[PDB]
Design a binder for this molecule. Structure first.
Ligand code: HEM
Ligand SMILES: [Ca+2]
Ligand SMILES: [Ca+2]
Length: 307
Protein backbone atom coordinates (compact mmCIF):
# COMPACT_ATOMS: atom_id res chain seq x y z
CA UNK A 1 0.00 0.00 0.00
CA UNK A 2 1.40 3.39 -1.06
CA UNK A 3 2.19 5.80 1.79
CA UNK A 4 0.07 8.96 1.81
CA UNK A 5 0.32 12.31 3.68
CA UNK A 6 -3.45 12.34 4.24
CA UNK A 7 -3.57 8.90 5.87
CA UNK A 8 -4.87 10.25 9.19
CA UNK A 9 -6.90 13.22 7.91
CA UNK A 10 -10.15 11.45 8.84
CA UNK A 11 -9.08 9.14 11.66
CA UNK A 12 -6.83 11.60 13.52
CA UNK A 13 -6.58 15.07 11.92
CA UNK A 14 -4.96 16.47 15.06
CA UNK A 15 -2.08 13.99 15.21
CA UNK A 16 0.57 16.44 13.95
CA UNK A 17 -0.75 19.15 16.30
CA UNK A 18 -0.44 16.86 19.32
CA UNK A 19 3.10 15.86 18.32
CA UNK A 20 4.07 19.50 17.78
CA UNK A 21 2.70 20.60 21.17
CA UNK A 22 4.56 17.80 22.94
CA UNK A 23 7.86 18.87 21.36
CA UNK A 24 7.22 22.57 22.01
CA UNK A 25 6.87 21.97 25.75
CA UNK A 26 9.85 19.61 25.89
CA UNK A 27 12.07 22.14 24.09
CA UNK A 28 11.63 24.56 27.00
CA UNK A 29 13.50 22.26 29.38
CA UNK A 30 15.57 20.35 26.81
CA UNK A 31 16.60 22.41 23.74
CA UNK A 32 18.34 19.29 22.44
CA UNK A 33 15.17 17.17 22.09
CA UNK A 34 14.45 18.37 18.53
CA UNK A 35 17.80 17.10 17.25
CA UNK A 36 17.43 13.90 19.30
CA UNK A 37 14.02 13.04 17.81
CA UNK A 38 15.16 13.55 14.23
CA UNK A 39 18.03 11.18 14.92
CA UNK A 40 15.71 8.55 16.40
CA UNK A 41 13.74 8.51 13.13
CA UNK A 42 16.99 8.20 11.17
CA UNK A 43 18.14 5.26 13.31
CA UNK A 44 14.71 3.71 12.97
CA UNK A 45 14.65 3.85 9.16
CA UNK A 46 18.18 2.52 8.67
CA UNK A 47 17.30 -0.74 10.40
CA UNK A 48 14.65 -2.80 8.62
CA UNK A 49 13.06 0.42 7.51
CA UNK A 50 10.95 2.92 9.42
CA UNK A 51 8.99 0.45 11.56
CA UNK A 52 9.58 1.82 15.07
CA UNK A 53 11.67 -1.28 15.73
CA UNK A 54 14.14 0.97 17.53
CA UNK A 55 11.49 1.92 20.10
CA UNK A 56 11.20 -1.69 21.31
CA UNK A 57 12.63 -2.59 24.71
CA UNK A 58 14.35 -5.89 25.62
CA UNK A 59 12.56 -9.26 25.68
CA UNK A 60 13.82 -12.74 26.47
CA UNK A 61 13.50 -13.64 22.78
CA UNK A 62 15.20 -10.65 21.09
CA UNK A 63 17.60 -7.89 22.16
CA UNK A 64 16.72 -4.19 21.91
CA UNK A 65 18.35 -1.98 19.29
CA UNK A 66 18.97 0.50 22.11
CA UNK A 67 22.09 -1.48 23.04
CA UNK A 68 23.58 -1.14 19.54
CA UNK A 69 26.92 0.63 19.24
CA UNK A 70 25.17 3.53 17.55
CA UNK A 71 22.38 3.84 20.13
CA UNK A 72 23.81 2.80 23.49
CA UNK A 73 24.61 5.82 25.66
CA UNK A 74 23.79 7.98 22.62
CA UNK A 75 20.19 7.83 21.38
CA UNK A 76 17.73 9.73 23.57
CA UNK A 77 14.21 11.16 23.84
CA UNK A 78 12.42 7.81 24.14
CA UNK A 79 10.30 9.02 27.07
CA UNK A 80 9.21 11.99 24.97
CA UNK A 81 7.96 9.66 22.23
CA UNK A 82 5.95 7.73 24.86
CA UNK A 83 4.38 11.03 25.95
CA UNK A 84 3.09 12.11 22.54
CA UNK A 85 2.15 8.49 21.89
CA UNK A 86 -0.06 8.46 24.99
CA UNK A 87 -1.61 11.82 24.04
CA UNK A 88 -2.35 10.70 20.49
CA UNK A 89 -3.80 7.45 21.85
CA UNK A 90 -6.23 9.46 23.99
CA UNK A 91 -7.34 11.59 21.06
CA UNK A 92 -7.37 8.69 18.62
CA UNK A 93 -7.43 5.20 20.20
CA UNK A 94 -5.44 2.55 18.33
CA UNK A 95 -5.00 4.69 15.22
CA UNK A 96 -1.52 6.14 14.82
CA UNK A 97 1.41 3.73 14.62
CA UNK A 98 4.66 4.40 16.42
CA UNK A 99 6.48 4.29 13.09
CA UNK A 100 4.31 7.09 11.68
CA UNK A 101 4.36 8.95 15.01
CA UNK A 102 8.17 9.01 15.02
CA UNK A 103 8.19 10.17 11.39
CA UNK A 104 5.86 13.06 12.21
CA UNK A 105 7.86 13.90 15.35
CA UNK A 106 10.99 14.09 13.22
CA UNK A 107 9.34 16.41 10.70
CA UNK A 108 7.93 18.67 13.41
CA UNK A 109 11.31 18.75 15.14
CA UNK A 110 12.94 20.00 11.95
CA UNK A 111 10.27 22.68 11.48
CA UNK A 112 10.38 23.76 15.13
CA UNK A 113 14.17 24.17 14.87
CA UNK A 114 13.60 26.55 11.97
CA UNK A 115 13.71 24.03 9.15
CA UNK A 116 11.36 23.45 6.19
CA UNK A 117 7.74 22.49 6.78
CA UNK A 118 5.98 19.73 4.84
CA UNK A 119 3.57 16.83 5.20
CA UNK A 120 5.36 13.49 5.47
CA UNK A 121 3.84 10.42 3.79
CA UNK A 122 1.95 8.25 6.30
CA UNK A 123 0.58 4.73 6.55
CA UNK A 124 3.53 2.87 8.09
CA UNK A 125 2.94 0.10 10.61
CA UNK A 126 4.95 -1.19 13.60
CA UNK A 127 7.34 -4.14 13.59
CA UNK A 128 6.94 -7.35 15.58
CA UNK A 129 10.57 -7.48 16.63
CA UNK A 130 13.73 -5.43 17.10
CA UNK A 131 16.98 -5.89 15.17
CA UNK A 132 20.12 -5.38 17.27
CA UNK A 133 22.53 -7.14 14.91
CA UNK A 134 21.13 -5.34 11.89
CA UNK A 135 21.50 -2.01 13.72
CA UNK A 136 25.17 -2.71 14.43
CA UNK A 137 25.78 -3.58 10.82
CA UNK A 138 23.71 -0.82 9.21
CA UNK A 139 24.21 2.29 11.34
CA UNK A 140 27.15 4.27 9.90
CA UNK A 141 30.12 5.31 12.08
CA UNK A 142 31.73 8.78 12.42
CA UNK A 143 35.08 7.35 11.26
CA UNK A 144 33.73 5.95 7.97
CA UNK A 145 35.46 7.09 4.78
CA UNK A 146 33.28 8.55 2.02
CA UNK A 147 33.16 5.22 0.15
CA UNK A 148 31.97 3.47 3.34
CA UNK A 149 29.44 6.24 4.01
CA UNK A 150 28.02 5.87 0.51
CA UNK A 151 27.93 2.09 0.95
CA UNK A 152 26.00 2.38 4.23
CA UNK A 153 23.30 4.50 2.59
CA UNK A 154 23.10 2.33 -0.54
CA UNK A 155 22.78 -0.67 1.78
CA UNK A 156 19.45 0.56 3.14
CA UNK A 157 18.23 1.78 -0.24
CA UNK A 158 19.54 5.32 -0.75
CA UNK A 159 21.74 5.31 -3.87
CA UNK A 160 21.86 9.04 -4.48
CA UNK A 161 24.75 11.14 -3.25
CA UNK A 162 22.18 13.89 -2.69
CA UNK A 163 20.54 11.65 -0.05
CA UNK A 164 23.84 11.38 1.83
CA UNK A 165 24.78 15.06 1.50
CA UNK A 166 21.29 16.38 2.25
CA UNK A 167 20.50 14.03 5.13
CA UNK A 168 23.95 14.73 6.60
CA UNK A 169 22.58 18.24 7.02
CA UNK A 170 20.90 16.90 10.12
CA UNK A 171 24.16 17.93 11.75
CA UNK A 172 23.13 21.56 11.48
CA UNK A 173 22.19 21.08 15.15
CA UNK A 174 22.54 18.59 17.99
CA UNK A 175 25.41 17.31 20.14
CA UNK A 176 28.42 15.01 19.66
CA UNK A 177 30.65 13.38 22.31
CA UNK A 178 34.37 14.21 22.46
CA UNK A 179 34.93 10.46 22.14
CA UNK A 180 34.20 10.46 18.40
CA UNK A 181 36.76 13.12 17.46
CA UNK A 182 39.71 12.35 19.78
CA UNK A 183 41.46 10.67 16.86
CA UNK A 184 40.97 13.68 14.55
CA UNK A 185 42.36 15.95 17.27
CA UNK A 186 45.45 14.04 18.39
CA UNK A 187 46.15 10.89 16.34
CA UNK A 188 44.30 10.44 13.05
CA UNK A 189 44.77 7.02 11.41
CA UNK A 190 47.84 6.25 13.51
CA UNK A 191 49.81 9.19 12.12
CA UNK A 192 50.49 10.72 15.52
CA UNK A 193 49.04 13.91 14.02
CA UNK A 194 45.60 15.56 13.81
CA UNK A 195 43.36 15.17 10.78
CA UNK A 196 44.81 17.56 8.16
CA UNK A 197 41.34 18.27 6.75
CA UNK A 198 40.32 19.98 10.01
CA UNK A 199 40.78 23.79 10.17
CA UNK A 200 43.78 24.49 12.43
CA UNK A 201 42.08 27.36 14.24
CA UNK A 202 39.03 25.19 14.92
CA UNK A 203 41.36 22.35 15.89
CA UNK A 204 42.62 24.50 18.77
CA UNK A 205 39.06 25.21 19.89
CA UNK A 206 38.09 21.53 19.80
CA UNK A 207 41.27 20.57 21.65
CA UNK A 208 40.21 22.88 24.47
CA UNK A 209 36.75 21.30 24.63
CA UNK A 210 38.18 17.79 24.33
CA UNK A 211 41.64 17.60 25.94
CA UNK A 212 43.56 14.34 25.66
CA UNK A 213 42.70 11.97 28.52
CA UNK A 214 39.73 14.19 29.33
CA UNK A 215 36.00 13.50 29.69
CA UNK A 216 35.15 11.52 26.56
CA UNK A 217 31.45 11.97 27.27
CA UNK A 218 31.58 15.78 27.15
CA UNK A 219 29.33 17.22 24.43
CA UNK A 220 30.25 19.52 21.53
CA UNK A 221 27.99 21.18 18.93
CA UNK A 222 27.86 19.77 15.41
CA UNK A 223 27.48 23.26 13.98
CA UNK A 224 29.72 25.99 15.43
CA UNK A 225 27.71 28.64 13.62
CA UNK A 226 24.14 27.91 14.74
CA UNK A 227 24.22 24.99 17.26
CA UNK A 228 20.44 24.69 17.61
CA UNK A 229 19.04 26.23 14.44
CA UNK A 230 18.16 24.09 11.43
CA UNK A 231 19.84 25.88 8.54
CA UNK A 232 22.38 25.35 5.77
CA UNK A 233 25.27 26.69 7.91
CA UNK A 234 26.43 23.10 8.33
CA UNK A 235 27.62 23.17 4.73
CA UNK A 236 29.32 26.53 5.06
CA UNK A 237 31.42 24.98 7.84
CA UNK A 238 32.49 22.13 5.57
CA UNK A 239 33.72 24.59 2.94
CA UNK A 240 36.05 26.05 5.59
CA UNK A 241 37.09 22.59 6.77
CA UNK A 242 35.10 23.03 9.95
CA UNK A 243 33.01 19.86 9.83
CA UNK A 244 32.92 18.32 13.33
CA UNK A 245 33.34 14.59 12.69
CA UNK A 246 35.32 12.75 9.99
CA UNK A 247 32.18 11.66 8.12
CA UNK A 248 31.13 15.32 7.84
CA UNK A 249 34.34 16.76 6.40
CA UNK A 250 34.78 13.92 3.91
CA UNK A 251 31.67 15.02 2.04
CA UNK A 252 33.86 17.88 0.90
CA UNK A 253 37.48 16.75 1.37
CA UNK A 254 37.53 13.05 0.47
CA UNK A 255 39.41 12.05 -2.71
CA UNK A 256 36.12 10.37 -3.68
CA UNK A 257 34.07 13.54 -3.18
CA UNK A 258 33.94 14.59 -6.85
CA UNK A 259 30.18 14.12 -6.74
CA UNK A 260 29.53 15.37 -3.20
CA UNK A 261 31.61 18.58 -3.39
CA UNK A 262 29.26 20.32 -5.86
CA UNK A 263 26.31 19.25 -3.69
CA UNK A 264 27.85 20.67 -0.49
CA UNK A 265 28.47 24.01 -2.21
CA UNK A 266 24.99 24.00 -3.71
CA UNK A 267 23.33 23.60 -0.30
CA UNK A 268 25.81 26.03 1.23
CA UNK A 269 24.97 28.76 -1.28
CA UNK A 270 21.18 28.49 -1.10
CA UNK A 271 18.90 27.71 1.82
CA UNK A 272 15.99 26.92 -0.50
CA UNK A 273 18.12 24.45 -2.44
CA UNK A 274 19.16 22.70 0.78
CA UNK A 275 15.65 22.71 2.24
CA UNK A 276 14.16 21.23 -0.95
CA UNK A 277 16.86 18.55 -1.05
CA UNK A 278 16.45 17.81 2.66
CA UNK A 279 12.71 17.27 2.32
CA UNK A 280 13.19 15.10 -0.74
CA UNK A 281 15.86 12.96 0.96
CA UNK A 282 13.82 12.75 4.19
CA UNK A 283 10.79 11.37 2.37
CA UNK A 284 12.99 8.86 0.55
CA UNK A 285 14.48 7.70 3.85
CA UNK A 286 10.95 7.58 5.24
CA UNK A 287 9.91 5.27 2.41
CA UNK A 288 12.49 2.58 3.19
CA UNK A 289 10.87 -0.88 3.40
CA UNK A 290 7.75 0.21 5.32
CA UNK A 291 5.13 -2.21 6.62
CA UNK A 292 1.74 -1.18 5.22
CA UNK A 293 -1.87 -2.33 4.94
CA UNK A 294 -2.39 -5.20 7.38
CA UNK A 295 1.32 -6.01 7.74
CA UNK A 296 2.64 -5.40 11.24
CA UNK A 297 0.41 -3.64 13.74
CA UNK A 298 -0.56 -0.42 15.44
CA UNK A 299 1.47 -0.68 18.63
CA UNK A 300 -0.31 0.85 21.65
CA UNK A 301 2.86 1.07 23.74
CA UNK A 302 5.83 1.78 21.45
CA UNK A 303 8.07 -0.13 23.86
CA UNK A 304 6.36 -3.50 23.45
CA UNK A 305 4.53 -5.56 20.85
CA UNK A 306 0.76 -5.84 21.34
CA UNK A 307 -0.34 -9.09 23.03
C1 HEM B 1 26.29 10.06 7.24
C2 HEM B 1 26.40 9.25 8.44
C3 HEM B 1 26.28 9.73 9.74
C4 HEM B 1 27.16 9.50 10.75
C5 HEM B 1 28.42 8.62 10.67
C6 HEM B 1 26.68 10.19 11.93
C7 HEM B 1 27.31 10.19 13.19
C8 HEM B 1 26.78 10.78 14.36
C9 HEM B 1 27.43 10.75 15.67
C10 HEM B 1 28.73 10.06 16.03
C11 HEM B 1 26.62 11.42 16.52
C12 HEM B 1 26.96 11.74 17.97
C13 HEM B 1 26.33 10.73 18.91
C14 HEM B 1 26.70 10.96 20.37
O1 HEM B 1 27.56 11.83 20.64
O2 HEM B 1 26.14 10.27 21.24
C15 HEM B 1 25.45 11.84 15.76
C16 HEM B 1 24.44 12.68 16.26
C17 HEM B 1 23.36 13.19 15.53
N1 HEM B 1 23.10 12.89 14.19
FE1 HEM B 1 24.32 11.95 12.93
N2 HEM B 1 25.44 10.79 11.67
C18 HEM B 1 25.16 10.46 10.35
C19 HEM B 1 23.96 10.76 9.71
C20 HEM B 1 22.87 11.44 10.27
C21 HEM B 1 21.56 11.57 9.64
C22 HEM B 1 21.18 10.95 8.31
C23 HEM B 1 20.77 12.31 10.49
C24 HEM B 1 19.44 12.73 10.35
C25 HEM B 1 18.88 13.27 9.15
C26 HEM B 1 21.57 12.55 11.66
C27 HEM B 1 21.14 13.32 12.76
C28 HEM B 1 21.86 13.50 13.94
C29 HEM B 1 21.45 14.32 15.06
C30 HEM B 1 20.34 15.35 15.07
C31 HEM B 1 22.37 14.14 16.03
C32 HEM B 1 22.39 14.86 17.35
C33 HEM B 1 21.57 14.04 18.32
C34 HEM B 1 21.50 14.67 19.70
O3 HEM B 1 22.02 15.78 19.88
O4 HEM B 1 20.90 14.04 20.59
N3 HEM B 1 22.85 11.99 11.54
N4 HEM B 1 25.56 11.46 14.43
CA1 LIG C 1 13.51 0.31 12.11
CA1 LIG D 1 22.69 25.18 12.38
Amino acid sequence: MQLTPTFYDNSCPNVSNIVRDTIVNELRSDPRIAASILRLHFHDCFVNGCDASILLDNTTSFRTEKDAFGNANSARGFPVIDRMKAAVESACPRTVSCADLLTIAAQQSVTLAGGPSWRVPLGRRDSLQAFLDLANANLPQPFFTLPQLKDSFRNVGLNRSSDLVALSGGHTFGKNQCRFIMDRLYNFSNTGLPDPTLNTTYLQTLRGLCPLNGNLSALVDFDLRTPTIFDNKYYVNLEEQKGLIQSDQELFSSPNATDTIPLVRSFANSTQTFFNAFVEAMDRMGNITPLTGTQGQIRLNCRVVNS
